[PDB]
Amino acid sequence: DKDVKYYTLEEIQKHKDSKSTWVILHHKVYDLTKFLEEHPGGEEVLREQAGGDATENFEDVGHSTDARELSKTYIIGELHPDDRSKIAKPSETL
Ligand code: HEM
């Protein structure tokens, strides 16, 4: 069973490698480590950015629709409500 594990942007900008690719697509801590062994196309691309900001590039490829909704299924803990309360309106678009 489980609990929300609200982690800050900073914390998530630590980890990267080693079966732990968490991302801030659209202001939420998304675990891609599961998808590292599932996601269509490849996992290397997932891991490249990892704990950074793999949003713009992801949307550039056209991750809207289905994948965008599925993004929400990788919710393991979300952002810290602190950061998240001040989440500046990012950008754009696709
Ligand atoms: C957690 C969010 C993610 C979800 C739910 C997701 C889901 C998907 C899905 C369903 C496809 C196929 C789309 C289609 O067939 O129309 C796809 C393809 C792809 N994804 Fe993701 N993805 C995610 C994150 C990422 C990230 C972070 C990257 C790297 C920036 C990435 C790079 C790619 C690439 C390169 C493809 C292959 C494009 C092709 O089929 O030629 N994805 N993704």
Q: Name the strand (E) or helix (H) holding 24.
A: strand 22-25
Which H or E run contains 28? strand 28-31
Which amino acid is located at 38 in the chain?
A: E
- Ligand 1 interacting residues, C-beta cut-off 6 A: 23, 25, 30, 32, 39-41, 45-46, 49, 54, 57-58, 61, 63, 66-67, 70-71, 74
Kind plus residue range of the DSSP H or E element containing 29:
strand 28-31
Structural domains of the chain, with CATH: 1-94 (3.10.120.10)
Task: Give the Å distance between the CA of 81 and the centre of ligand 1.
Answer: 27
Q: Write down the H helix ranges in the chain.
A: 9-12, 44-49, 56-61, 65-71, 81-85
Tokens 């001040």 sit on residue? 86
Contact 22, 28 (CB under 8 A): no
Distance of CA 28 to the CA centre of its chain: 6
Q: Which two tokens stand for residue 22?
A: 């968490």
Identify residue 17 by its one-letter amino acid code. D
38 CA to centre of own chain: 15
* CB atoms closer than 10 angstroms to residue 29: 26
Q: Reduced to 3 states, what is the DSSP secondary structure of residue 85?
A: helix
